[PDB]
Write a protein that binds this ligand. Sequence first.
Ligand code: CTP
Ligand code: CTP
Lengths: 417, 418
Amino acid sequence: MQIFRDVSKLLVERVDPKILNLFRLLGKFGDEVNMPVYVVGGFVRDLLLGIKNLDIDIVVEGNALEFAEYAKRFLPGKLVKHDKFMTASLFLKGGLRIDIATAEMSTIKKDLYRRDFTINAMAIKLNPKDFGLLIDFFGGYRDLKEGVIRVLHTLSFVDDPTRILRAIRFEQRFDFRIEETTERLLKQAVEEGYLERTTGPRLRQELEKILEEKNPLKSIRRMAQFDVIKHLFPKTYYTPSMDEKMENLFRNIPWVEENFGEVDRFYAVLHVFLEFYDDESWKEVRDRYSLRRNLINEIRHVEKSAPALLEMLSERVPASFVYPLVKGVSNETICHFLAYLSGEKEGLFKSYLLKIKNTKLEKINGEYLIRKGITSGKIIGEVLEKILMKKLDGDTRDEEEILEEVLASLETEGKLA
Amino acid sequence: MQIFRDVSKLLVERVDPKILNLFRLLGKFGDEVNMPVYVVGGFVRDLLLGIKNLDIDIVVEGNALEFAEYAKRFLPGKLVKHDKFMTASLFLKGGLRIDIATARLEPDVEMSTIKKDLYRRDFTINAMAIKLNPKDFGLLIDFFGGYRDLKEGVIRVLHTLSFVDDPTRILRAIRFEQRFDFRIEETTERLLKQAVEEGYLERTTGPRLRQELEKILEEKNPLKSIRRMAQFDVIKHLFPKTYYTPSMDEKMENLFRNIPWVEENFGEVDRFYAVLHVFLEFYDDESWKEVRDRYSLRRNLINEIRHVEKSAPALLEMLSERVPASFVYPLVKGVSNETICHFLAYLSGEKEGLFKSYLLKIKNTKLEKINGEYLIRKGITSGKIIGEVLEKILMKKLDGDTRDEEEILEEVLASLET
Ligand SMILES: Nc1ccn([C@@H]2O[C@H](COP(=O)(O)OP(=O)(O)OP(=O)(O)O)[C@@H](O)[C@H]2O)c(=O)n1
Ligand SMILES: Nc1ccn([C@@H]2O[C@H](COP(=O)(O)OP(=O)(O)OP(=O)(O)O)[C@@H](O)[C@H]2O)c(=O)n1
């Protein structure tokens, strides 16, 4: 179809002036040193979708270093010269970095063939002669305009399997869908075991992004269809009974964040993903990605403590009984428990969660009062804890609490004196 | 010669990047908004001379306003349009101004129209243009050999009637000669001398002339500019009763020699007014008004001028014999800074000296600090008497050292007597 289009009007309309002047200027610098200058990637895409974008990715046909230095004489900022990739980055002020990379000059075609998705292909030339020129050898404009995610060629995934997760994140991100031939090509690489053949850090960064994106649940369930879950983490199985927890997790994570603070979504997920894990299955998952020595312990905790919790929620036990299972736990671990709760139990587990968060306040009485009482050692802790454990269900004068509490220890023997 | 040169290399090497950027931008706007864009006039001259200029003249072929609004959309400044005789002026944060104008015929004949705009100008060195539009960024456009005239240092009008069209250029040409060390060439000198001989100065308006003179006096060597003026006879043709003779010219030298000393002691000196204090001395009431209402001069000028013009000889005798300083005060009383110059205009060496000191003594020590107009409420109420008493004790104090009060009771003998 059409390779060229005049987004020149669209540039001045959408793009902030301070930036336009940059594209304008960068283009002129191009001419001055004889290098075609293009802005590329996610900016082209975003400008087209009316979505704001500050990233200003740039390709030249010459030498990014030579160009980047020329640019600096007239642009104000820090020049970082990533030799060995012939890349560069001019750091201006206001919070702006121009990423400058290196490549019928249309060698930019070969450069745009190397990418993931037609909508992320495409380039806009910058040299004054061709200033507003949209370049689209692969009909990104078309897919962009009918919400499509096409992987430029049949080896896109083989060449880089991380695009498997990217493809998925883009769907939720822009609301687009993956056309058939990609869909087919994805599965093939997943099943070919291709993304196992890839590094931890890489698969994980991308995994994090998916979770930080618009809709997480939907993209995990999506990830499920394609059977990538099973291929990142060798033992997990996305069943109606694993999913269901996942749903629970994401429904109240907002509550967790509201009363307890940040929730590391990645981890919150691993919890449900990583359950029922033999030691040889974890020392690696943990090892391949970088999970926390021991995280395994914490998932187990909820895993094990789990059938006891709903019972404990049924039978409306006093909070005194719940504490043991949520005592210095992470927000992720709290989330994990919540993965189990539908409806009325939820309001309760939460109802105790705020009791246990609060009223932990001993007010007067601890540490001191006890040692003046003349007690020492690890005991102090247990007596303190067992006072508070009852202050969460009904309060006296917080002294009389001990004078009743130490007694309970006496005539069962507790220290001496 | 070469009508077209590529000075792109100079632009980047010799031009401050913030400006050299604004050029690139102004030229890109041009292409966007479809209009050739040039910088012209003074800047191009100065650039090629390696001189700094922050008054950038841009000429566009198209609407000037249109282009200016379109520029601001993308620039950080204040925009004043000037609607009739379309031209715009863009004030930028950097402390500089873009002056934007429509070329005005009202590849395709782009050069014709700009050449029309250039031919319209005063001198070759100022009739140059540099194209900003990206396609031709470096482009120096020089039809009239203004480039070669820079290197040769030559000043040259563009065509035979350059002076007939704007006789005010008679003065500009002398200015640029003293400003850069250039010499007005033969032909334009021939031409310059007619315009003045025939009377194109009297034919040009007063106010334009005065400004152009003020400019000549603010520039680098005014004495030279005035002498060059006198060599072309242009002085008689500005002021009909002033004859620039060895005497007047000695006065002028002494004047300009002293202005500086006078500035760093009495402050701003209007040099156009000082120079008039010489040009007009011994003017008659009639020829004075004539010239006053012609250059919108101050009305009590003539009195001050007559004041020196009448006492100069007295001042000369006083500074002779070294007459003590009580007697010269009344000559310098409450007079202009220029009036102070005008005197100095008559002086050189040793007299200039002793006269310098006097004026110090006079502004320097006129304290009367101890008394006031209280000491005078101690016995006297007359509106003129209070005022004379005071100016009386002053002069006593002007070259005499004594307490204060006790000289009042003392010189009040010369007063209570008679
Ligand atoms: N594994 C990858 C990563 C990136 N790209 C290409 O590089 C461009 C820029 O990478 P990135 O900045 O991550 O693109 P976006 O997804 O739009 O940016 P973000 O990840 O922040 O959303 C993409 O548009 C894509 O063309 C690719 O082909 N293969
Ligand atoms: N009588 C005049 C006055 C000006 N010009 C043109 O208009 C330009 C701008 O006028 P001006 O600002 O006075 O130029 P400069 O002499 O450089 O500025 P200045 O007088 O302050 O030195 C000049 O370069 C010249 O091309 C002209 O041709 N005829």
